[model samples]
Target: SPLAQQIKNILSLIGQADAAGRMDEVRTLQLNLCQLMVEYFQGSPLAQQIQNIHSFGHQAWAAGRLDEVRRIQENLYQLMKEYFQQS
Candidate 1:
């Protein structure tokens, strides 16, 4: 579950960036997370869900919906943790 750990670390970075009000950094980290998820889940049903969540999260950010962005991140964080526990 190295990948899950990596994603967890990146999610923390995203939270740090958000706390620091670094919008661009947050967006970049978000993209990195999405890419990781999509890459890991390619050719699976989860891939589409990951992509859609990324899209929605990005839209939420662009619209200044930080709460929604945080919600999305929380969901991803738990998901990664769940996978890690299984591993």
Candidate 2:
């Protein structure tokens, strides 16, 4: 399951970077996660959900809703974890 493995690896890297307080690394990891989801889950239900979540986050950020951005990101992360487990 290359997709699952990739998701797990990237997630682990994200966790490590976050634990080390590396904001830049965390941002990169988030971008990578979005890219991976787009690449691997293209045209899938989860893909659409992920894209929607990303869109909402971006919109919230643009509107200066920092808390909304965090909430969207956190919700997306949880959804990704659940999808990964199911897949």
Candidate 3:
């Protein structure tokens, strides 16, 4: 299905993770997202974008800033939609 269900689940959970202030959960999901993109999308530039954004968000999470993490998640979410939903 080419990430059909996986992308749906990831997009849905992004909000849940953001709502819960689950900084750790955010990284877990972001890692999963990156892995999914790498596997499903291969050499997509947005895959690299996701990885870099996740790394950036990790810094925010480590810095103990919930707002920053949420901002990063929002960006990631947009990228996912842009990349995965157009097909």
Best by TM-score: 2
lDDT of 3 by residue, 15-57 (tens): 6897899978876887787677656644577878876886787
* Model 3 weakest lDDT span, ten residues long: 34-43
Error of 2 at 82 (Å): 1.6
Residues 1-87, candidate 2: write the lDDT tens digits: 787789878888887899999999999998888778777665578768877887788789889999988999888887777777632
Backbone clash pairs for candidate 3 read none
Best to worst by lDDT, what's the order?
Answer: 2, 3, 1
Candidate 1: tens digits of C-alpha lDDT, residues 1-87? 677677777778877898999999997997887777766654345545665776687789899999998998677566655543432
Give all candidates' CA lDDT scores: 0.72, 0.81, 0.75
Question: What is the Cα root-mean-square deviation between model 2 and the actual structure?
Answer: 3.0
The window of 10 residues in a row where model 1 has the poorest summed lDDT is 78-87
| Candidate 1 lDDT for residue 11 | 75
TM-scores of all candidate predictions against the true structure: 0.54, 0.73, 0.55
Cα RMSD, model 1? 5.0
Model 3 regions lying over 4 Å from their true place: 1-4, 12-42
lDDT for 74 in candidate 3 is 82
